[PDB]
Structures are given as structure tokens and as C-alpha cells.
Design a protein around this ligand. Structure first.
Ligand SMILES: *[C@@H]1O[C@H](CO)[C@@H](O[C@@H]2O[C@H](CO)[C@@H](O)[C@H](O)[C@H]2NC(C)=O)[C@H](O)[C@H]1NC(C)=O
Ligand SMILES: *[C@@H]1O[C@H](CO)[C@@H](O)[C@H](O)[C@H]1NC(C)=O
Ligand SMILES: *[C@@H]1O[C@H](CO)[C@@H](O)[C@H](O)[C@H]1NC(C)=O
Ligand code: NA
Lengths: 180, 344
């Protein structure tokens, strides 16, 4: 049940030095996000989100995911419920497919983590890492627990990754011999 | 999804529009503006990426478009329609190692690219063979209002299937024909052939044809009527399947099919209808938006966006007044009668 407007910032505490969400606009923060929900009136919500370039881009990516999650929690929950809640759930028939998909996604995620470690100087893998940090921060935030990874991190194959891979799954499904 | 890239008469403007086809249950929508400060590489000496600013049509918890439609501060507009793959012999190219999933490849290309060539170059690396799309990359930096064809750089077409990515600059073709339409069918004959579409043309006919499918045909017939932003909205919203001969499905009973339009309304197909293949059935699926931009609008990181199934010439979709009232659609309006809005 989203409010018209919600603004959250993620500050890195000078002392802690821990990340904490605050309400409102704080341009000193690592990131801030503003969700305006006009779905009832226009069929759209609007998000704008900024990260602070005075922090490195890893922390920015993570924080970007965190702040998006914090201003859109209800929308995330509902979208998840509408779209992917049951996908490979606890009670799936297609356990053959779902196990293959979990294996695939875990191996894929591990392969990228490995490539990032093996290629700390790579622009490409750097951009991949930022993308996954953003994903990680989004999931962490929604879960209510902020852990900024400085090295390798684990993405849940069937967590918020599921919201990103809907188009990928259209082909993963047949490639992993799901019936149809 | 449908897309149209329209060169206005006299090259007055270049309009770029995309209409997502999706399950209606996906209709919690967020238009997202990201203002990031990422660098190209893991060191502070690295330049800021070309694509730090981006507006895109999206969904809750979805850290990319999914549609896709993006306006990037690098002057690029990236959009796709999905081609998929019907050749099972290509699936061996879908591997957990050596394949970066499409959504990440998309985000990364969007971030690093300053032009269509580099977008294609970045995106095609570690081709996963998943979310197999035709991507259109419009570089508005290469667009001169009123100017003649610059020969290159305005339009880059990329088509991905497993094990194969084909890329061409299609500026000349855009300027010559005055449009680029996209409608879920690969344009590159090598991609069309490699992904098993010939067999489906052979079995089902024109629907799988690049040039003869209903949308190709409607675009061929009607694209020139897009003379401005609202005309673009209108063609992108287009569904008049009951009365449009181009919406006739000859193997179907009844013959008018709501799938056979620019903006599908599969919900309006009869449940007891007889249909040669699943796309044509009654479904809680169809066009669920239009997003449109222009040279000036892209420049200001801005778009016209309309949310919901088309209601220009079809009754407005309304969950409670639909075969799909029991489907989960939390947070979603019941009645979908929304007009385009400037965003923002
Ligand atoms: C970017 O910034 C963060 C924050 O300053 C760095 O993370 C700190 O790293 C030290 C040593 O790695 C840790 O002990 C601190 O606990 C980290 N702080 C936080 C907030 O977690 C980080 O190393 C920098 N670089 C990268 C690549 O992330
Ligand atoms: C799926 O089945 C095919 C045979 O149709 C087989 O060759 C292939 O190894 C299988 N792929 C996976 C990943 O299960
Ligand atoms: C594609 O397939 C068609 C039908 O078999 C054939 O006529 C054509 O030569 C092929 N084209 C290419 C470029 O592969
Ligand atoms: Na798509």
C-alpha cells in the first residue's frame, strides 16, 4: 500500500562505519531515492535515484539497490506476488527443471564472482560487479539487513535475481528442457 | 512487444517508441531515473561511464527495464523486441560459464556505450543465448534534425540467439524507408534461419514471416501516418482487431484475432475460440504500455508514456470485468483507462 511520495537515503556513518537508512533527502548520503506513486491516477509510479560520486562506485551500486528497495518495498512485494512468487516454489512439479535451473543460476553466479576476482582491473567485470552489487543491495535492503560486500558475495538464485531474469527464463526454460 | 523508430517527413524529428507486450499481471510499473556516478573501471582514475544517467520503463525490484526501453544521458536510446529461438540445437550455447545473462549485458552495454557500435560490442560479449532480442540502438548524437542521411551511427540493429549475435548499422535503411519497425521476428535472415523460423513459416504461414506477419503488415500500411508524438502513441496503441483485415487469422475461428495488432489484447479473444497456436489464444497478455521519445525529449531525458492495455478501439481492460478477475494483481488498478503522460 505505497504512499504518494517516499524519500530515503543511505548514509555511511563516519564512525560506525555502517550504512543506515534515513528518511528524506540527504545529498551527503551514498544514495537517495524518491518514489512517487501515481499508479491509481496514471498507471505509473516514478522512481528517481541518485548515488554520490564522493563514494566509490561499488558502494554506490550497493546503496542504489538499497535505496530503491526502501522506497518501493510494498510495490516489490506485490509485484513479486503477482509475477514470480510460485516460480520453482517449495511445491514445484518441475523439480527436474527447477533443480537444473538452480544449478545453472548458482554456477553462473559463481562464474561471474570468479571472473571478478580473476580480473580486478577489468572495466567489463567491474560493470558486471556494480550491477550485481545493486541487485545485492536491493535484496539486502528489502530483507532489512545491510551488508556491503568488499569482495565476493552470493546472490540468491531465486531471490530478487528472479525479477531480473524473466526475459532470460523464456530461453532458460526450453534450454534446460522444461516442458512445454 | 512492438517498436517503431520513425523518421518524420523532412527528417524533422526521429521518434522512437516501444510498446511492451506482457502478462497483465506484470502491470505494476515504475518509470525509473537513475543518476549514478560509476566509472568505467575499478579505479578512481577511470572516467565516469557514458551511461550514468538513464530513464527507463520498469517494474518494482527490477534494476533494468525488462521492456526494454531506455533513454541514456549518452544520447543513446536503447529498446528491444524479443525474437527467442525455436531451434533446439542452439540450446547447447546456453551455458552457466561463459555466459552473462541478458539483463546484465544490457545494463553494462547501457552504461559503457557512447555509440551504437560500442553498445553492440559490449552487449554481445558472453552471449547467453537467453532473452534473445532484436535490439535497436538509436544514437541521437548522430541525428541532425532536418539533415540528410549521415550514412551511419543513427541506428544499430543487433540480433541475439544462442551462439550468434548479428549487428548492422541500419541508418541507411532507416533513412531510405523512413522507419524501423520491430515485432518479435528477426530481421537478419541468418538469425531468422538459424533460430528455426522457416519451419514455422512453413507450418503456420505469414504470422512467422518477417515481412508478412500482421504487425509487419500494419506497420507497412500505417507507419507513414506517424507524423508526430501523438500519432506514434496512436499507432503503438493500435488494436482494432474486429474490423482490421490485417487482424484476420485465417486458420482461426473466429477470424479476427486481438493478438494481430500493434498493441495485442489477447484477453479479448474468445476462450472457446479455435487457434492454430498458443500466441493466438485468449490470454491475460498483450500490449501493456507505450513509451515514446523524440530528439528533444531524449535530450531532456524524457518520454511520453502510457500504461495499461490499449483502449483506443478496444473496450478498456478491467480485471473484475475480464476472464481473469481471479488472477493475482495486487496493487493494480482494476480498470485500465490511462492516457499518455510526460515523464517527467
Ligand atoms: C569502497 O568503499 C568502501 C567504504 O569506504 C570500502 O569498504 C570498507 O572497506 C574496509 C576494508 O575493506 C572495510 O573494513 C570496511 O569495513 C568497509 N566499509 C564498509 C562500509 O563496508 C570499500 O573497500 C571500497 N571499495 C570497494 C571496492 O568496495
Ligand atoms: C536436454 O535434453 C537434450 C535432448 O533433447 C539433451 O541433449 C541435453 O543434454 C539436455 N540439456 C540439459 C541441460 O538438460
Ligand atoms: C534461409 O532459409 C531460406 C529457406 O530455406 C533459404 O531460401 C535462404 O537461402 C536462407 N538464407 C540464409 C541467408 O541463410
Ligand atoms: Na522484451
Amino acid at each position: 500500500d505505497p504512499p504518494v511520495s517516499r524519500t530515503r537515503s543511505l548514509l555511511l556513518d563516519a564512525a560506525s562505519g555502517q550504512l543506515r537508512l534515513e528518511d528524506g533527502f540527504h545529498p551527503d548520503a551514498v544514495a537517495w531515492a524518491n518514489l512517487t506513486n501515481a499508479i491509481r491516477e496514471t498507471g505509473w509510479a516514478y522512481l528517481d535515484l541518485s548515488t554520490n560520486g564522493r563514494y566509490n562506485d561499488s558502494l554506490q551500486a550497493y546503496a542504489a539497490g538499497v535505496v530503491e528497495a526502501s522506497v518501493s518495498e510494498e510495490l516489490i512485494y506485490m509485484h513479486w506476488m503477482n509475477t514470480v512468487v510460485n516460480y520453482c516454489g517449495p511445491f514445484e512439479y518441475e523439480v527436474g527443471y527447477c533443480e537444473k535451473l538452480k544449478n545453472f543460476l548458482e554456477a553462473n553466479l559463481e562464474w561471474m564472482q570468479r571472473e571478478m576476482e580473476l580480473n580486478p582491473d577489468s572495466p567489463y567485470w567491474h560493470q558486471v560487479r556494480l550491477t550485481l552489487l545493486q541487485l545485492k543491495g536491493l535484496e539486502d535492503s528489502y530483507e532489512g539487513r545491510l551488508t556491503f560486500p568488499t569482495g565476493r558475495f552470493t546472490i540468491k538464485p531465486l531471490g530478487f535475481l528472479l525479477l531480473q531474469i524473466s526475459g532470460d527464463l523464456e530461453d532458460l526454460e526450453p534450454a534446460l528442457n522444461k516442458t512445454n | 512487444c512492438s517498436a517503431l523508430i520513425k523518421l518524420l517527413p523532412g527528417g524533422h524529428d526521429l521518434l522512437v517508441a516501444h510498446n511492451t507486450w506482457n502478462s497483465y499481471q506484470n502491470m505494476l510499473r515504475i518509470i525509473k531515473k537513475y543518476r549514478l556516478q560509476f566509472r568505467e573501471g575499478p579505479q578512481e582514475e577511470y572516467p565516469l561511464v557514458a551511461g550514468n544517467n538513464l530513464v527507463f520503463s520498469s517494474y518494482p525490484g527490477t534494476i533494468f527495464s525488462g521492456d526494454d526501453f531506455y533513454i541514456l544521458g549518452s544520447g543513446l536510446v536503447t529498446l528491444e523486441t524479443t525474437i527467442g529461438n525455436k531451434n533446439p540445437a542452439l540450446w547447447k550455447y546456453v551455458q552457466p560459464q561463459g555466459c552473462v545473462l541478458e539483463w546484465i549485458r544490457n545494463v553494462v552495454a547501457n552504461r559503457l556505450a557512447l555509440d551504437g557500435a560500442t553498445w553492440a560490442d559490449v552487449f554481445k560479449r558472453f552471449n547467453s543465448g537467453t532473452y534473445n532480442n532484436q535490439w535497436m540502438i538509436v544514437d541521437y548524437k548522430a541525428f541532425l534534425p532536418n539533415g540528410p542521411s549521415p550514412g551511419s551511427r543513427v541506428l544499430t540493429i543487433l540480433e541475439q540467439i544462442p551462439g550468434m549475435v548479428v549487428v548492422a548499422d541500419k541508418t541507411a535503411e532507416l533513412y531510405k524507408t523512413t522507419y524501423w519497425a520491430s515485432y518479435n521476428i528477426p530481421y537478419f535472415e541468418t538469425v531468422f534461419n538459424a533460430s528455426g523460423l522457416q519451419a514455422l513459416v512453413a507450418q503456420y504461414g505469414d504470422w512467422f514471416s518477417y515481412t508478412k506477419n500482421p504487425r509487419a503488415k500494419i506497420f507497412q500500411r500505417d507507419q507513414s501516418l506517424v507524423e508526430d508524438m501523438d500519432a506514434m502513441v496512436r499507432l503503438m496503441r493500435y488494436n482494432d482487431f474486429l474490423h482490421d483485415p490485417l487482424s484476420l487469422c485465417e486458420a482461426c475461428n473466429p477470424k479476427p484475432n486481438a493478438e494481430n495488432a500493434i498493441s495485442a489484447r489477447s484477453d479479448l479473444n474468445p476462450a472457446n475460440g479455435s487457434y492454430p497456436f498458443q500466441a493466438l489464444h485468449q490470454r491475460a497478455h498483450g500490449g501493456i504500455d507505450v513509451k515514446v521519445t523524440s530528439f528533444t525529449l531524449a535530450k531532456y531525458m524524457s518520454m511520453l508514456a502510457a500504461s495499461g492495455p490499449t483502449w483506443d478501439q478496444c473496450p478498456p481492460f478491467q480485471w473484475s470485468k475480464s476472464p481473469f478477475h481471479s488472477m493475482l494483481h495486487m496493487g493494480q488498478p482494476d480498470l485500465w483507462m490511462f492516457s499518455p503522460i510526460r515523464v517527467p
